[PDB]
Prior knowledge:
2 copies of one chain form a homodimer.
Chain A: E1 3-7, H1 13-26, H2 33-45, E2 49-56, E3 59-71, E4 76-86, H3 95-109, E5 115-120, H4 124-132, E6 136-138, E7 141-147
Parallel strand pairs in A: 4-5
Antiparallel strand pairs in A: 1-2, 2-3, 3-4
Bound molecules: acetyl coenzyme *A, coenzyme A, bromide ion (18 copies), magnesium ion (2 copies) and sodium ion (2 copies).
Domain N-acetyltransferase (chain A): 3-148
Keywords (chain A): Acyltransferase, Membrane, Transferase, Transmembrane, Transmembrane helix
Pfam family, one (chain A): Acetyltransf_1
Amino acid sequence: HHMIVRRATYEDLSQLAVLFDEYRQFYGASSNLEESHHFLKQRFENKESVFFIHIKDEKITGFVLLYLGFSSVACSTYYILDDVYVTPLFRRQGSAKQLIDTAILFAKQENALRISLETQSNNHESHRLYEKMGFIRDSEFQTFHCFL
Amino acid sequence: HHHHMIVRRATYEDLSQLAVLFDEYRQFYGASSNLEESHHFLKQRFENKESVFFIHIKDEKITGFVLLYLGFSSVACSTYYILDDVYVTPLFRRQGSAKQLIDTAILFAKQENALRISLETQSNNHESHRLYEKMGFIREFQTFHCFL
Ligand SMILES: CC(=O)SCCNC(=O)CCNC(=O)[C@H](O)C(C)(C)COP(=O)(O)OP(=O)(O)OC[C@H]1O[C@@H](n2cnc3c(N)ncnc32)[C@H](O)[C@@H]1OP(=O)(O)O
Ligand SMILES: CC(C)(COP(=O)(O)OP(=O)(O)OC[C@H]1O[C@@H](n2cnc3c(N)ncnc32)[C@H](O)[C@@H]1OP(=O)(O)O)[C@@H](O)C(=O)NCCC(=O)NCCS
Ligand SMILES: [Br-]
Ligand SMILES: [Br-]
Ligand SMILES: [Br-]
Ligand SMILES: [Br-]
Ligand SMILES: [Br-]
Ligand SMILES: [Br-]
Ligand SMILES: [Br-]
Ligand SMILES: [Br-]
Ligand SMILES: [Br-]
Ligand SMILES: [Br-]
Ligand SMILES: [Br-]
Ligand SMILES: [Br-]
Ligand SMILES: [Br-]
Ligand SMILES: [Br-]
Ligand SMILES: [Br-]
Ligand SMILES: [Br-]
Ligand SMILES: [Br-]
Ligand SMILES: [Br-]
Ligand SMILES: [Mg+2]
Ligand SMILES: [Mg+2]
Ligand code: NA
Ligand code: NA
């Protein structure tokens, strides 16, 4: 093969940390490769999180991070799509679509109820991506935060 | 120590009584009552490494509970808590059980150096909105679901 979407491994973390650090910069964080790599390795070692990466000609182009959720009402599990990012050079080539296609197949393999996520209301690009992938906008619930 | 009311972490010994309230909570969200199913799933959540249950006991009766679980913020490279489920049985409502449960959840999250406590509640749940606003919670993001 020449392109692949697959689960991340320890061997990928050094290159993946660069993209994870770029993703943090998109949301306003200052670049800090040491901090980004440390936290990426903490999430990678956690049993309930799943990383898929898209590789094209041995370069990581993007990633998706999911984690297990529990629904008390249904008495079943689901997945939360927490982070999705494709590096600018590789955008608009289907990397995010392929990453989400794999996340959907993975969630079906795990008999998940659904994949849920939250994205900024003003993030035009992400809304179009999610709608293309079969996600439905839902405003039944309201989020609240207690800042500590 | 001598006390008559307490908010404390749940133990295996509390699960049989706690399952009654957990079953009522599931019925609040539309599920059919099934004590066996509710208890089985409550025990599965209790056995998740990052889940934290607090229960409120008044005169040896469990009046209510809160269930929190660990969240990871990739942007901040830090952890936070999600307040997933909150419930007080009707006989004990409007006595401060939920306020006391959330007061303890806040102290617990501060002990763990969490960034915040976040939650989602139904947009039509006017009682919960008043509770969360009283406790210091604040109402930018849109939820999407893929039902697989
Ligand atoms: C819940 C969360 O975690 S939200 C996190 C959202 N992530 C971000 O916004 C990070 C910054 N942005 C990015 O990394 C990227 O632009 C992404 C992830 C949004 C898209 O990655 P890409 O690989 O470029 O997307 P891909 O090429 O697979 O596009 C698939 C669909 O997404 C939509 N889309 C992607 N980019 C755009 C864009 N710039 N404008 C409009 N729609 C877009 C389209 O529907 C597109 O289908 P199409 O090309 O046939 O029209
Ligand atoms: C919401 C709920 C947890 C409140 O529990 P509670 O122990 O009765 O609440 P408290 O007595 O601690 O009340 C604290 C504050 O919440 C608000 N509140 C609680 N019940 C309310 C009601 N029926 N109407 C309006 N405000 C209400 C008020 O701000 C109240 O402060 P006040 O009594 O000084 O005015 C309870 O009604 C419940 O279990 N409801 C069903 C499940 C649910 O909605 N859970 C939350 C979503 S998971
Ligand atoms: Br490879
Ligand atoms: Br992984
Ligand atoms: Br659900
Ligand atoms: Br494609
Ligand atoms: Br897999
Ligand atoms: Br569902
Ligand atoms: Br966003
Ligand atoms: Br006790
Ligand atoms: Br125990
Ligand atoms: Br026991
Ligand atoms: Br109820
Ligand atoms: Br849990
Ligand atoms: Br009493
Ligand atoms: Br007593
Ligand atoms: Br009891
Ligand atoms: Br504790
Ligand atoms: Br925060
Ligand atoms: Br508010
Ligand atoms: Mg949940
Ligand atoms: Mg997160
Ligand atoms: Na660090
Ligand atoms: Na930040």
